[PDB]
Structure 1
Amino acid sequence: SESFVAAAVSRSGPAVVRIDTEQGSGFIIDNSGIILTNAHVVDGASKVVVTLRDGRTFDGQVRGTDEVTDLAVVKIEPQGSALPVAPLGTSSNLQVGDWAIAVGNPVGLDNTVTLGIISTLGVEFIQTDAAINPGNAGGPLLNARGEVIGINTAITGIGFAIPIDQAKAIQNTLAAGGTVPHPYIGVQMMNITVDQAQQNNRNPNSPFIIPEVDGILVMRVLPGTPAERAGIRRGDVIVAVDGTPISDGARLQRIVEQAGLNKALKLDLLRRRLSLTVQTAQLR
């Protein structure tokens, strides 16, 4: 009778809510009034209005946002009949080609639904060709069974969603109104190849000579950052973190994250050879 899409919607779309600050979608994940959405939906208003698909409206309190992840948590007070809940899936089970259903509640009285698949898997955003629109953003992304596997964002036609397993790791902290830790050092960085460095040094108009190595080229030192304060300059080649050699910027990020906030890291750089200690700080 019903397609599998209409069925998944029937499972999880009741709990998809409209969110208005004076706008987008979110979804209730616990009978106690915990609601997930995007930071772009709510921030920086601390007061929102939630509307259930059934037309019940609630005074929503923004519990906190994490701009780095584009996630926020809103709480409402469960009065009267029980709040419908969307069941959460696991995004680590996704495969490219899995069905993907994007549900909004932009009006408050019905769901908006679009269908597509998982297009890419890496925030490590899920990519999908399920059309993602305003108002549909901040709503859930379901798998074929109707479980939440992600949170739509309005970021072609390809759309991005925050994997659910990332929200599930951040949810406690955001509900408590705390700051999610995001350590960084503040450089735009690029993996540099020796063929790329010799190629660079052949060009009379490259901005700077590069020491013909496999490394992490500092492309830019962001203002106000630990990297600027440590004295790092554009054109520096990062050759290793403390001891371990590196040629991959993505690996450097993971070393900085595993360090934590307010940790000193020692960097091996070429400018000459130069070691500098950077104090990780919170990305803002």
Structure 2
Amino acid sequence: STDETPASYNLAVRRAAPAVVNVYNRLEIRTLGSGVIMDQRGYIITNKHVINDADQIIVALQDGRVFEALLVGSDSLTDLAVLKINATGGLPTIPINARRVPHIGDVVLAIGNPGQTITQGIISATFLQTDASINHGNSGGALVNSLGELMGINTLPEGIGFAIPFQLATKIMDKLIRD
């Protein structure tokens, strides 16, 4: 068995896990939830709920770096929020594939922080429904396929989880950045 390799979804994790961060409040410090680094500019999606009633927002990467974050705006209807941080050289960004089409049955990992936690499941249906366990911390976290490509943003029917389609999430983010 030492020769053979164990079936795993590790590749996807290495690709997307660095992009997913912990979100915090701020002396008093509390843990709010998860978030995702979209682009180099330093824009980060997260849930509207974590941001609310936050005086100071803090973000923590998997490599150890720690930033102060600015609230770019939110969207009540989809429970989303965007944040901004000063973009150093070589920020870890969540892999995105605008071309990929999410089909029902696709393997999906859910990444967040109910430390960092990776659950597995499939696309139950396409709002997006999945049976990868979604708790309080991994809300605002990522949801990617086996390739690692972003498929959705976890949010908050037992055993049933909800993610916002990445394309829709992408569009919402662009508008918030604008408006």
| Residue in structure 1 matched with residue 20 of structure 2 by the alignment | 16
Say which one has the larger Rg.
1
| Contact kept in structure 1, 2:114 and 2:135, CA below 8 Å | no
| Residue in structure 2 matched with residue 166 of structure 1 by the alignment | 168
1:127-162 CA-to-partner distances (Å, cap 9, x unmatched) read 100011111110110011001110001391010001
| Residue in structure 2 matched with residue 101 of structure 1 by the alignment | 109
Task: State the alpha-carbon separation in 1 of the partners of residues 105 and 137 from structure 2.
Answer: 25
TM-score of the aligned structures, taking structure 1 as reference length:
0.56
| Contact kept in structure 2, 1:87 and 1:148, CA below 8 Å | yes
Give the structure with the larger helix fraction.
Answer: 1
For the structure 1 residues 106 and 15, does the alpha-carbon distance in structure 2 shift closer, same or farther, using more than 3 Å as the test? Answer: farther
Provide the alpha-carbon RMSD of the alignment: 2.0
SS of equivalent to 2:169: helix
User: Aligned letter for 1:165?
Assistant: Q
Task: State the alpha-carbon separation in 2 of the partners of residues 6 and 36 from structure 1.
Answer: 23
Task: State the alpha-carbon separation in 2 of the partners of residues 138 and 85 from structure 1.
Answer: 15
Between Structure 1 and Structure 2, how many residues are aligned?
Answer: 170
User: Aligned letter for 2:125?
Assistant: T
For the structure 1 residues 148 and 9, does the alpha-carbon distance in structure 2 shift closer, same or farther, using more than 3 Å as the test? Answer: same
| Contact kept in structure 2, 1:16 and 1:27, CA below 8 Å | yes
Task: State the alpha-carbon separation in 1 of the partners of residues 78 and 169 from structure 2.
Answer: 9
Which structure is richer in relative contact order (CA contacts within 8 A, separation 6 or more)?
A: 2
| Residue in structure 2 matched with residue 137 of structure 1 by the alignment | 139
| Contact kept in structure 2, 1:47 and 1:62, CA below 8 Å | no
Task: State the alpha-carbon separation in 1 of the partners of residues 6 and 55 from structure 2.
Answer: 40
| Residue in structure 1 matched with residue 156 of structure 2 by the alignment | 154
| Contact kept in structure 2, 1:46 and 1:61, CA below 8 Å | no
Task: State the alpha-carbon separation in 1 of the partners of residues 128 and 6 from structure 2.
Answer: 27
Unaligned runs of at least 5 residues, structure 2 = 27-31
Correspondence for 2:68 among 41, 59, 62: 59
Unaligned runs of at least 5 residues, structure 1 = 179-284
Task: State the alpha-carbon separation in 1 of the partners of residues 100 and 14 from structure 2.
Answer: 24
1:226-249 CA-to-partner distances (Å, cap 9, x unmatched) read xxxxxxxxxxxxxxxxxxxxxxxx
TM-score of the aligned structures, taking structure 2 as reference length:
0.87
| Residue in structure 1 matched with residue 90 of structure 2 by the alignment | 82
Task: State the alpha-carbon separation in 2 of the partners of residues 19 and 141 from structure 1.
Answer: 17
SS of equivalent to 1:127: strand
SS of equivalent to 1:55: coil
